[PDB]
Design a binder for this molecule. Structure first.
Ligand SMILES: CCC(O)(O)CCCCC[C@@H]1NC(=O)[C@H]2CC23CCN(CCCCCCCC[n+]2ccc4cc(ccc4c2O)-c2cnc1[nH]2)CC3
Ligand SMILES: [Ca+2]
Ligand SMILES: [Ca+2]
Ligand SMILES: [Zn+2]
Length: 368
């Protein structure tokens, strides 16, 4: 039936700025919040302000030296850290910006707080649109991500759950999360992503885990132009087979919106309904669920996507006509919630989709 949903948001999150021209815009988190507030979705959720995660909470995964660096570096002192910046991959993709550490603390705080709430059985779903920063590594920033809030949230869930399933629908491969749990069977990682001449370059369908983790990493490599029909055709069957074989007791779903049509960095053709169908599929299994953000670089579409996915979590129907809001002008010229796919060619033929699905099904047969 209808579930209890807890939502994590800090009003300061939208003020963090990666710099002129940088595609990552935390302001999209504030647009999402304002849109969902104007639709009246606040009357149905418990809204919490996450704490600022401590360096100690972050070192449950990350190295002490890397977290000390993140807590110390600032634009005014960068000149003295040229050596550590290279070592930790701080540069154009992962720049030093004012309040970088506080931004990591809020992104992380929401994911860990959500995981604690799920562990205490005080909510059915926990949502943190500021999280989902899946590329961050143990001692290195990567792909606009500095602290891997997902890995930290999963480590929290592992305190009470024997098996945790991680599903990632961002257009980029969830490499940081896959790497963290690559040799364990206590987490199964499933990523659907563009593969081929695309960041981060990992996520081949032959990457299936190692040691005790063999068969516990799943990768579905895709080409440009995937649409709702094609994505829907493989997502439910793969997730149903994973649920059947793995029997997880908690799920984490990274809802990166860069897989939508018209994304500045992505080359997929999903609509908000197509993307949200993934949330409907996962929610149907009735397991404790942590829903996180991730990519999304056409910010009006990210706000639409995550507002609609919050409505899906709440089993609340909301009109296509957008309510007036603080960023109304960003949603022109139509001022509607749902989006149309483009005329781009879908390079993922129906035969390619079925063939990759069948290869993944062979690997899933290898689980105990
Ligand atoms: C949140 C989860 C997520 O959704 O999975 C995150 C997705 C991460 C994607 C990362 C990907 N990195 C690469 O493919 C690296 C191989 C690359 C090396 C670095 N250059 C950056 C050139 C920057 C030059 C201009 C400097 C200022 C403005 N600015 C900054 C960063 C930019 C990044 C991207 C596009 C313009 C910039 C610009 O215009 C950019 C696009 N794709 C990348 N970076 C690029 C090429
Ligand atoms: Ca992915
Ligand atoms: Ca694994
Ligand atoms: Zn992405």
């Amino acid at each position: 039936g209808k579930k209890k949903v807890c939502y994590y948001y800090d009003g300061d999150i939208g003020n963090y700025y990666y710099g002129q021209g940088h595609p990552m815009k935390p302001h999209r988190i504030r647009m999402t919040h304002n849109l969902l507030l104007n639709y009246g979705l606040y009357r149905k959720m418990e809204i919490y302000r996450p704490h600022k995660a401590t360096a100690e909470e972050m070192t449950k995964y990350h190295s002490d030296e890397y977290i000390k660096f993140l807590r110390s570096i600032r634009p005014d002192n960068m000149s003295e850290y040229s050596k550590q910046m290279q070592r930790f991959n701080v540069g154009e993709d992962c720049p030093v910006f004012d309040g970088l550490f506080e931004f990591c603390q809020l992104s992380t705080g929401g994911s860990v707080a959500g995981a604690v709430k799920l562990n205490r059985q005080q909510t059915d779903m926990a949502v943190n649109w500021a999280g989902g920063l899946h590329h961050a590594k143990k001692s290195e920033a990567s792909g606009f991500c500095y602290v891997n809030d997902i890995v930290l949230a999963i480590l929290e869930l592992l305190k009470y759950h024997q098996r945790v399933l991680y599903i990632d629908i961002d257009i980029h491969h969830g490499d940081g999360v896959e790497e963290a749990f690559y040799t364990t069977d206590r987490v199964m990682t499933v990523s659907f992503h563009k593969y081929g001449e695309y960041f981060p370059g990992t996520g081949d369908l032959r990457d299936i885990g190692a040691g005790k983790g063999k068969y516990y990493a799943v990768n579905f490599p895709m080409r440009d132009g995937i649409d709702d029909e094609s994505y829907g055709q493989i997502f439910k069957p793969i997730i149903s087979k994973v649920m059947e074989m793995y029997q997880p007791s908690a799920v984490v779903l990274q809802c990166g919106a860069d897989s939508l049509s018209g994304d500045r960095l992505g080359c997929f053709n999903l609509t908000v309904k197509g993307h949200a169908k993934c949330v409907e599929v996962v929610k149907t299994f009735n397991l404790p669920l942590l829903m996180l953000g991730g990519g999304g670089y056409t910010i009006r579409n990210v706000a639409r996507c995550w507002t609609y996915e919050t409505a899906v979590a709440l089993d609340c129907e909301i009109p296509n006509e957008l309510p007036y809001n603080d960023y109304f002008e960003y949603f022109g010229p139509d001022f509607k919630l749902h989006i149309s796919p483009s005329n781009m060619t879908n390079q993922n033929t129906p035969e390619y989709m079925e063939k990759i699905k069948q290869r993944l099904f062979e690997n899933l047969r290898m689980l105990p």
